[PDB]
Amino acid sequence: MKYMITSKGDEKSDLLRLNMIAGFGEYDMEYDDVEPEIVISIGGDGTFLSAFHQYEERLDEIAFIGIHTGHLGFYADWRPAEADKLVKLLAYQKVSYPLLKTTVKYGKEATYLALNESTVKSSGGPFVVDVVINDIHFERFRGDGLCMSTPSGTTAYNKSLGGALMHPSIEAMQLTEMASINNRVYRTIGSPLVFPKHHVVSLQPVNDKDFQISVDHLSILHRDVQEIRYEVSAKKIHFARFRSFPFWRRVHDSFIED
Amino acid sequence: MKYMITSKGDEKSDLLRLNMIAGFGEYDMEYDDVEPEIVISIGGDGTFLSAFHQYEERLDEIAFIGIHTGHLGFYADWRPAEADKLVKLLAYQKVSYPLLKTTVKYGKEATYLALNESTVKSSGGPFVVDVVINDIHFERFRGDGLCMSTPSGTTAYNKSLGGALMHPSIEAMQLTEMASINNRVYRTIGSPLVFPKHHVVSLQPVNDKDFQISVDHLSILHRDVQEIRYEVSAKKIHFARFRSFPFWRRVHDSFIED
Amino acid sequence: MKYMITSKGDEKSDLLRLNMIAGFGEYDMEYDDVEPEIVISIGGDGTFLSAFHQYEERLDEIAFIGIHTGHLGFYADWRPAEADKLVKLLAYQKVSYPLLKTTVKYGKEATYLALNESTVKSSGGPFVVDVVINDIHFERFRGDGLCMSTPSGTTAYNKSLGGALMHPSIEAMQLTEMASINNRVYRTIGSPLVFPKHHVVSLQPVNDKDFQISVDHLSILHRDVQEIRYEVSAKKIHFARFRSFPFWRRVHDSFIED
Amino acid sequence: MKYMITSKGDEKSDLLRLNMIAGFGEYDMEYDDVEPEIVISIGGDGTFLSAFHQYEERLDEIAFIGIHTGHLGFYADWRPAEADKLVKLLAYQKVSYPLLKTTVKYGKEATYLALNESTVKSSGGPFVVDVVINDIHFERFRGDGLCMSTPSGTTAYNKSLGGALMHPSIEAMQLTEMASINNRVYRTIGSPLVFPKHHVVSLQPVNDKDFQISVDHLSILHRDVQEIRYEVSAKKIHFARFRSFPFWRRVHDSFIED
């Protein structure tokens, strides 16, 4: 089976990568980083996020596995000490999580896939956008910005913004406010909003049309924007699971105690 | 078709009820408040909640309609001025929202259905419970209490507790904290948690076993509790809709401006 | 010097109390629990709160010291192992913290002093009060209740309600909301409010006049209430300090890590 | 008496300015925008903030007045229709509000005065700083940034970040978090913190030393920062008041209803 390994690039992770490669060498396994069917990420969640984006064009052909040699490592299912057990075991059931499609339109159009979230802020200056849900104008948002999160993303930036944590079996996206202004004149919903598949949330500029748009902690300035459009993707990320590690246990281990 | 009308019981609502009855009298419609197939509620959300509980044993045989003569009236789809249009029109498509099943166990067992939410607080004294998700211990909660909300309930008590607003097509329940203690010694997740169908959240007492349990703003003291169990119900509430009034528009009208 | 010791009443605390008494026996110190000048509390913050209320009529004659044999123990300045050092040292500078005066009026009048906070909730049923600041109507509050905190109280219930932590050298009181309803019809400030000395906050009933009123975790049902009035007290609690233990370090130790 | 008028620069504000000048022409009043003793700002809060910074070197010689022709206008005490009454009346008691001193140090040093707040964010990349209160390390902050607010600033950016509203007679500054990360590994206080005069809060970089620093909505990139230091200023802003318009009424009018 074709596979590749990414590494955080520190000494621990590179050696672990070389060892697993040596170990895969004792089985019918081909190292191919062009068309892998298995992608192993060794490092933190940042490393895992990079792996996902490195291969976001072949998501339906790939199953991902994360090994943690980072700090928090929330998409990690394995400690390094378990690495040889993993090479053997891999020589399994697939689990799918929902993703977020962002469409950015100008005056052509670009689309992006997120595993955690997509956010919008201004290119400096006040941020003001009209929020339109399924063609119906919902609110005019004034403030720092907005965050649209996938279910697995809900434990990340979304969480820090007061969003709910959402089991990844729920096909949804969640919109949270960053520092909205609310007074006599200006009004937002305040609460996070959870949208199902097939709902489209569109942000439309009011004055300024330059925005800093992020997808999974890669941030780009987009100029001359006419619309930013959010929807649950039809595409999913697939994980190879070799044992039960339930989402809520993963949440417990990362936030309550481990 | 068999139908009945509940009323908030003020002058406006009683007269409106009598008028619709007179109007139904001109069609093939039988007033039956034992086995209605249509239940019309005239009043606020409190009136609607009472109607739902009056008939919670025949939910699959009934389609509800709310007319607002109350204050906020969030489950209302009609203004009173539109009442004659409604009797005629009713002489339609059905829409279903998810419900919450609460199981309370002692040392037998009682179950309750909620349209908005179920909450737990102590019978006076400190509230401390162990929160167990799918048999796995998740956290020990210290504080004022906990709230488990349906999707349509998310705009109610849940909202005031910092919960996310959740489109009612999502089959889920949402758990929010009321004033949790968080220090060096005590730790909760903080964030709201959204659970899918088939997940079971169980609250288990630590010391005290007396709790004040609410279902939709009816509150009862339960003694000698061993467990409180939450799960998305298999049962649904059915609304008769005669026109499009999308959930997010309903949210916009109630919170942003109407 | 006249002194007394209260104890949490577990074995650890009673023995520690007996030992300090024996130790004070070797100095010019008289045990007097009617007119102590020093009040030593051995236990948690609950024990300390009880000590304060036991002697709230002689606050200007007393200096308090807390020893922690409890759990969190936030008003504690000493670990038990340091107890003999304390008896000797005590054989010192005084530090004063602000207090909250609550006035409850009927149809006579009762006043209460709080070290942590005073809260108001309804006697069951919806809670609705008009909030009047310095005779000017500020808001109509709908929700679970309200909390008025002293500076030292800000790390307690206030904190769980989203209040700010306030250095106790600031002569102020802080009002926080418990689960306020906010929609098209109903509106509260949302934010905590910090009031200086000489500002009076008055809660006035709208319909129901029965309230559950708490002062430092002692809760009483008050009937036929016309007004609840809050103001920074002219009275202060005095601590004996034998070493520097700054408030922010105390906050750090209790919430960040110790 | 020497005076000057700033204007938002729209037609309404310029004409109003010219009219007041004409009106001052009928009294013993000299227009001097180098050494005014009275500074009238005609526009919104942005206009008022600019006026304050235009003259921040002569704050003890000046009394400010705001006229609102803007949108919200929170530092405004007058509607335009009242302008002639103001010129006459001005032909009064002074009110002082506290200010925030920010010190930025490199490897020399710059100081800034704020009327609303000072914030710190990173120059792109993760923001991580050590927060040191009075030389004692309090927390390591990971997240979007931090906001230090004056009392009058508490109704502004601070409010949107969950800060408490603070009566401006309280000599204090308030620190609020922007989107802090909190998990198994990383921990912040969460709550806003209110500091008295003479307390020093120092932010110290961990890795990156480039920060975007704002003072009252003027934002500058500072490079090679060793420390950012916050303290209640010894300087105050003075308002000329011609009538009672209490802070809490000002809050009520701006947030609850006017």
Ligand SMILES: C#CCOC[C@H]1O[C@@H](n2cnc3c(N)ncnc32)[C@H](O)[C@@H]1O
């Ligand atoms: C800014 C910054 C870095 O902080 C990001 C933190 O969130 C973590 N993280 C990334 N993705 C997720 C995620 N999906 N859930 C929870 N935590 C996450 C990441 O490991 C790191 O601890």
Ligand SMILES: C#CCOC[C@H]1O[C@@H](n2cnc3c(N)ncnc32)[C@H](O)[C@@H]1O
């Ligand atoms: C680095 C790293 C891990 O991935 C970056 C993740 O950091 C998360 N993040 C970024 N900024 C913040 C933030 N301020 N608080 C919490 N999480 C954050 C966000 O989810 C992003 O995908």
Ligand SMILES: C#CCOC[C@H]1O[C@@H](n2cnc3c(N)ncnc32)[C@H](O)[C@@H]1O
């Ligand atoms: C306590 C109390 C009364 O306040 C309840 C408020 O919430 C409203 N309410 C009830 N159910 C819902 C609901 N499901 N969504 C939004 N608002 C709701 C009710 O109409 C009233 O305005």
Ligand SMILES: C#CCOC[C@H]1O[C@@H](n2cnc3c(N)ncnc32)[C@H](O)[C@@H]1O
């Ligand atoms: C009366 C009425 C309408 O229904 C009562 C609803 O009030 C809501 N509720 C009760 N207490 C609060 C509260 N404190 N804040 C907001 N909503 C509340 C809750 O959802 C309950 O079902």
Ligand SMILES: C#CCOC[C@H]1O[C@@H](n2cnc3c(N)ncnc32)[C@H](O)[C@@H]1O
């Ligand atoms: C309900 C309940 C018991 O929880 C109260 C918690 O708050 C603690 N506590 C009491 N007073 C304060 C206080 N003033 N500051 C911080 N924590 C406090 C008390 O020790 C306990 O940990």
Ligand SMILES: C#CCOC[C@H]1O[C@@H](n2cnc3c(N)ncnc32)[C@H](O)[C@@H]1O
């Ligand atoms: C027991 C004990 C210590 O003192 C009780 C303190 O508990 C605090 N408290 C009560 N309920 C809560 C609560 N739900 N969350 C946090 N603190 C709370 C409150 O400050 C009260 O004075």
Ligand SMILES: C#CCOC[C@H]1O[C@@H](n2cnc3c(N)ncnc32)[C@H](O)[C@@H]1O
């Ligand atoms: C970003 C941006 C513009 O929004 C700033 C909003 O806050 C208002 N504002 C400025 N200063 C204050 C202030 N000190 N208090 C309340 N509101 C304020 C300003 O008028 C405007 O409505």
Ligand SMILES: C#CCOC[C@H]1O[C@@H](n2cnc3c(N)ncnc32)[C@H](O)[C@@H]1O
């Ligand atoms: C423009 C203008 C009025 O002054 C700018 C003020 O906007 C406030 N501000 C900036 N960003 C936000 C924001 N996101 N939310 C609320 N207030 C904000 C902040 O207090 C700043 O001083």
